[PDB]
Symmetry: D2
Subunit: 106 residues, 4 copies
């Protein structure tokens, strides 16, 4: 999938997590986000098209995906443990990673 599709998948499922009542819902949404974030890894954002594929900027771009992937990973464990509220809070917290990357690169 393209960057925009992966971004909408990320966006859609974050809201699913907010409105969710149960672990399964959170679980499912986080799984989809993990796949979206991993697939986003190879993308070149439009503001970085003029940069070398292995530039410092591109390195920093992809680092944000590492952070987001790590966070989804942990939130998923929480939801697997049945810690719904705390997985939802981890989801709220990862928005900081979404925002930080958007502020620099979007």
């Amino acid at each position: 999938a393209d960057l925009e599709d992966n971004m909408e998948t990320l966006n859609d499922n974050l809201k699913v997590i907010e409105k969710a009542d149960n672990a399964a819902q959170v679980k499912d949404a986080l799984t989809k986000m993990a796949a979206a974030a991993a697939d986003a890894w190879s993308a070149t954002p439009p503001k970085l098209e003029d940069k070398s594929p292995d530039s410092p900027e591109m390195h920093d771009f992809r680092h944000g995906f590492w952070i987001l992937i790590g966070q989804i990973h942990d939130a998923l464990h929480l939801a697997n443990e049945g810690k719904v509220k705390e997985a939802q809070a981890a989801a709220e917290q990862l928005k900081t990673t979404c925002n930080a990357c958007h502020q620099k690169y979007r």
Copy 2:
């Protein structure tokens, strides 16, 4: 790319890191490993064809890529710091992750 290509990329660059003489070579190889691992995320292994895409087995399979991706991430920081030997050591230690997944799923 498919699973097999990602796996060759992973294997090829691990050997490149072993033979490397400077941090640029390690850095370049780890970057290629991270892309390969991230791209591998969505793959279904032949041994798990018969399992649901959202099965416990498939979750455990993808978990190994989380572990791999985290370790590459960290090793790349070490290489960026010019810590060639310790980045090469981190790379040798990664093999545990490679092996553990192969033993169960390959």
Copy 3:
């Protein structure tokens, strides 16, 4: 050190990172934060004095320190790479961990 002293160390160095001009200042402050957070691990917060040392609650409390330690770890790599701004951003972002734990346990 006590929980309070570790908490002040954490507080003080966070501000040091905000005002910092170079990577060495940030590195030094994160190093101090890492030791404070690791030393905090064994503490029982006043709100949880009545809970068993290996209770659900106490596990969740210490989980927040795993999260914080992980974040400092990564931020320190960024500072080591000379990525001052992004290390400072990483430091602003880990405030979410600080606050999440306080909201629940302070």
Copy 4:
């Protein structure tokens, strides 16, 4: 506790996990390992007594504790999920971290 005691704690509980029959035994063991690892953070190893407390070598020493702590953290989540065998395998795998640090610093 001192370095030796923390190392004994780490060693004893690793064996407990190997012999374990259920998730509770592995959970309990990993919990103790986490505390021992976090307490070990501040220690100076006999081989690095002559180095500055904020030396490059001391930084690399403590870095291995970060990686150990992260692995215990993850292994604990697996045990929490009731994935006993997988938690026991994550425990086997972190021996790589134990050994890597001993090779350089013990």
